[model samples]
Target: MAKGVAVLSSSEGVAGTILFTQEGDGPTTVTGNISGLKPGLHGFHVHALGDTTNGCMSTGPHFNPAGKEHGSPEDETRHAGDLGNITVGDDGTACFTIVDKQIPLTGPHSIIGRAVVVHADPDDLGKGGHELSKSTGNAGGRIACGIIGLQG
Candidate 1:
């Protein structure tokens, strides 16, 4: 009972694919195996534009259709794309399956055609005691990205 996918491709330190699956009315399940991470945490989110013509930079900001702030997926004021962070193991690999309640696979909250990006830095979740984190999460450069597509 799900319908979302992405094939992440990059020559940089980010590579791999991730899948978003929905079961029932619960949060979306994001599962993927990525490599070349920096061996720590990194910000991950769904961007507004799906056009990856200029790499991850052209994806724009998070998909905040509701015009919310940059915060964690668990936060009520979080952006629809604020998925927080992913932890890369010491092996430079990140295998994760996170649940995000804000973004969905269909309906008004559908993220289809959007892009999922892995940032170079960890997401401060807007709690770094400043507006920098609130505006951009201080998440540095976009390392990798993939466009979200429908399953059927």
Candidate 2:
């Protein structure tokens, strides 16, 4: 199995750990336990760069090597980096697992070395009608981000 991890952190006090694993050509399992966010849905995605020299902003835009429009995870033409949203409870924590087919652990389009960012607002899934909806889901500011590092 190939595995990876991202240790999320930010000046906003948001923190968490996200784990990724895959066996052969199977789907990738993304398990995460995050906290210190508002009580609601937050946009969660992988950015194009592992660089965080300027905080999360330096990570650049969403990882869209396929040149698709921003859409929900269920959307057939969605960006590969779009993993949808993670819901936070009243206690300000979110623990969930996501099975994704677009991102892989091994291959030319592997997610390794990319950056995972936690957004300040819910992802509109590119249908919110906002100006930035089709591009960023109008997810607002970047709260936290972590680089995906390979493990095994």
Candidate 3:
């Protein structure tokens, strides 16, 4: 099976890594650490494109293999890449571990060569009561990002 990795960085000083490892024969284990952030929650996701020509704007949209609406990681009809939130402690550091069923290193759900982004603010998980809420989770501006690459 194939695996991937992402090294996240931001113009505002956030930095981290997301390691993708195959579990058994399917899905991928996403685990990583992030530091240099505000003491609160933030959004993390796998985006549609790896291009960073205009920062996170170049990422196009969320990775939606099943063409579903955006929702929390726990939602059944959510986009394939909606990872929900990451909470940074007062010391400005955080880590995450999620078992993803929709992203792969190859094939239709492949996420390699795509982008991963960290938002400035928290994600509302589609409960914000706004049109953009379901699309962007009301998450504020993008603060950090990186491209998912193949692991050697």
Residue 66 CA error for candidate 1 (Å)? 1.3
lDDT of model number 3 = 0.86
Candidate 3 C-alpha error for residue 132, in Å = 1.2
Write candidate 1's Cα lDDT for 1-152 as tens digits: 76788888776857888899887667898998899888998999899889888888889999998898888888888888998899999999999888888778878778888999998898999998666788668886788999998886
lDDT values of the candidates?
0.86, 0.93, 0.86
Give Cα distance to truth, residue 68, candidate 3, Å.
1.6
User: How much lDDT does candidate 2 score?
Assistant: 0.93
Deviation in angstroms for 28 in model 3? 1.1
* Residue range 22-79, candidate 3, lDDT tens digits: 8545877889799899988898889999998898789978888787888998899688
Name the top TM-score candidate.
Answer: 2
Candidate 1: C-alpha lDDT: 0.86
Candidate 3 at 66: error in angstroms? 1.9
Clashing pairs in 3: none
- Model 3 TM: 0.94
TM-score of 2: 0.98
